[PDB]
C-alpha cells in the first residue's frame, strides 16, 4: 500500500534524529573526561551534571524517535 | 606575552608597580608600616 | 641561621629558562606556556635572593 | 591539600588545610581543590577568597606573585603584597585609577605606556575588589 | 496518496533538524562541566546560564518540530 | 498531486538546515560558559559577544527556514 | 508535471547546506569567546578576524541558497 | 512489492544516523587523549569513563542500525 | 522496475552516514595534535589511543558501507 | 522532462555537501583565533596555515559545486 | 525511464557524505594551528601528523566520491 510506503519512508527518515544526540553526547562525555581530569576531586558533581546532560539530550532524541514511532504504528 | 613583556619590562618591574599601587591604596593608618619594610636601599657598584 | 651561635654556610641552585623548559621532570605541570615559565623564573630568582638576604 | 599562603613579610596559612581556593592568574582566574592538576601559573592583581574547610571564606587581596599547585595536592601561594581587604581605601583606589589614566597619554615610550597600564589595571582590580 | 506520502516525508525531513540543536545542547552542557571543573566558585552562575543555553536551543528544536507538525496536520 | 507533493517534500527538506544553526548556537553558549568561568572580569563584553553570535546563527538558520516557508507558499 | 516538482525538491535538498555554515559560525564565535577571555589586549584584532570569518563563512553558506533561488525564479 | 522498495528507501535514510555515533566516538576519544595528556595519573578512571561514553554513543549508532533492519526486515 | 530505483536510493542515503565517522576521525586526530603538543613525552601512547579511536570510528563507517553494499548488491 | 528533474535534484543534493566545507572553515577560523590569542608572536605563520586549511576545504566544497555547475551547463 | 533518473538521484544522495570529510579536515587543520601556537618547538612533528590525518580523512571522503562516480560513469 502506497500509504504504507510513506509510513516506512517517513520512519526511516525521522529516525536520523539520533545522530545529533550521538554527537552531542560524545561531546558531553569528552568534556566530562577533561573536567574530571583537571579537577579530580569534583568527580561526583561533574558526573551529576554529566548525567543531567546525557539524560536531557537523549530526552529530546528519544522524544523525536517516539514521535516517529507513533507515526510508524499507531497514528 | 602580555603587553608589558614586549615593552621590555621584566616581570619584576610589573610586580614592583602592582605592589606599589596596592600600597598607595593602603590607609595612612597602615601606611606607617607599609612605607617602612617597602623601600629598596641597595646601591650598585659597577666593574 | 640555625641558632644564636650556629650558622651553616649553604649554596642553592638557580635554573635558567632553557634548563627548566627542557626537562622531562616537570612535563606534567599543566597550563605552562613557554612564557609563564619566563615570568615564574624571573620571580623565583628575586624570591630566592630575598630569602638568602634575610637568612 | 596543604595550603601555604605567604607574603614577603607575613604568613597567613602555613601548611594549613582549606577546602577550595579561588586564585587569580595571568591567564584569567580559576580554582583549586585537593587534587587539582599541577600548574605553574603566576598571579595578577586580584583577590584570593580562600574557602576554609568549614563555611568561612576569607578574602585576601594580592598584588602579584606566584601560585604553584603541587604534585602531592599541596599549594604554595606567594604574593609580593598580600593585604586583607579592610586595609584598602576604595575611594583612593578609584582616584588612583583615574589619575593613572590621566598620565596615560604622557608616555613618550611604549614601555612607559605599559607601566601606566600596569598601574591602571592593578588599581581597577582593586576598585572592583572593594565592592 | 502522493500528497499523503509527501506530508510524512516532509515531516521526517523537518524532525531531522532538531538533531543539530541536540548537538548544541551537548556542547553547552559539556562546557558547563569543564567550566565548573576549572572554576567551581561560580557554580550558581554557571548552572544558571547553562540551563539558559539549554532552553534557548530547545527553542530551535521546538521550532523545527512545530514546523513538522504544522506541515503534517495543518498544511 | 505530483507538484504539490514535491512542494511538501521541498519544504520539509529545506527546514533541516536549522540543525547547523542550533548546533552553532549551542557552541556559542558553551563557549561563553567556558570563557566566563575563566575570566569573570569581562562579563559584560562576554555576554555582548554571545548574544550577538546567538542572534547571528539563529538568524541564518531562520533564513534556511525562510527558504522553506517561501517554497511552501511561493 | 515534474519540472516544478523537481524545482521544489532541489530547493529543499539544496538550502540545507547552510547548516554547515551555521556550525562554522558557531565554532568561530566560540573560539572568539575563548580568545577574548585569554587576552583582552587584542580585542580589535579579534573583532577583525571574527567578522572576516563570518563574512567568508556565510559567503560559503549562501551558495546553496543562491542555487535554489536560481533554480526557482529563472530555472 | 513496491512497499519493499519503500522499506529500502527508509532503511537507507535511517542509516544516516550512524554519523552521530561516529562523531561522538571521535570527540570522546579525542577528549580522552586530552585528559590522558594533561593529567597522565588518571589514565585508569579516564579510560573507564571514556569507554562508558563510547558505549552510550554506540548506543545511538546500534539503535539506528537495529531500527534500520527492523523497518527493512520487520 | 522500481526496486532498482529503491536500491539506488538505498546506496545514496546509506553511504551518507559515513560523514559522521569521517568527522569523528578528524576530531580524534585533532585531539592527537593537541595532546602531543601538550605532553610530547607520551607520543607512543598517543598513537595507541589514536589508532584505537580510528578503529572505533571506521567500525561505524564500515557499517555504513556494508549496509550500502548489502542493499545494493544483495 | 525526467532528465531535467534528475539534473536539478542532483545539483541540489550535491550542493549540500558544502556543509562540511562550512564547518571546516568555521573551525579553522576559530582555531586561528585561539592560536593568535594564546601566542600572538606567530601570527603570520598561524594565518598562513589557516589560509591553507581554508583553501584545502574550499576545494572540497568546489568539488560538489562544480558537479552542480557542470550539470547546469552540460550533463 | 525512472531508473535512468534513479541512478543520478542515488548518486546525488551519496555524494553528500563528504560533509564529514570537510568538517574533519577543518578540525584537524585548526588543531594544527593551536598546537603550533602553544608549542612552536614541535612544528615538524605536528605537520607530519597533520598530513597523516588530512590524507586519512580525505581518504574516506574520496571513498564517498568514488562511490558516487562509480554510480555515475563506471556503472
Residue numbers in the entry:
A (entry chain R), E (entry chain Q), G (entry chain O), J (entry chain N), K (entry chain M): 1 to 75
B (entry chain I): 1 to 47
C (entry chain G): 165 to 219
D (entry chain H): 16 to 146
F (entry chain P), H (entry chain K), I (entry chain L): 1 to 74
Authors' description from the paper:
Each monomeric unit in the dimeric bovine enzyme described here is an assembly of 28 polypeptide chains of 17 different kinds, organized into a spherical catalytic globular domain that extends from the inner mitochondrial membrane (IMM) into the mitochondrial matrix, attached to an intrinsic membrane domain by a central stalk and a peripheral stalk (PS). This membrane-bound enzyme is a machine that transmits by a rotary action the potential energy of the transmembrane proton motive force, generated by respiration, into the catalytic sites in the extrinsic domain.
The dimeric enzyme, inhibited by residues 1 to 60 of regulatory protein IF1, was purified in the presence glycodiosgenin, Brij-35, and phospholipids, and its structure was determined by cryo-EM of single particles. As it rotates, the asymmetrical central stalk brings about structural changes in the three catalytic sites, found mainly in each of the three β-subunits, which alternate with three noncatalytic α-subunits in the spherical extrinsic domain. In the current structure, the postphosphate release angles are 28.8°, 26.2°, and 25.5° in states 1 to 3, respectively. The PS is an essential component of the enzyme’s stator linking the α3β3-sphere of the F1-catalytic domain to the membrane-associated wedge and the adjacent a-subunit into the stator subcomplex against which the rotor turns. During catalysis, it prevents the dissociation of the α3β3-domain from the central stalk by clamping it in position from above, and it resists the rotational torque of the central stalk, preventing the α3β3-domain and the rest of the stator domain from following the direction of rotation. A cap provided by the N-terminal domain of the OSCP is linked to the N-terminal extensions of the three α-subunits and adjusts its connections in concert with the rocking of the α3β3-domain during a catalytic cycle.
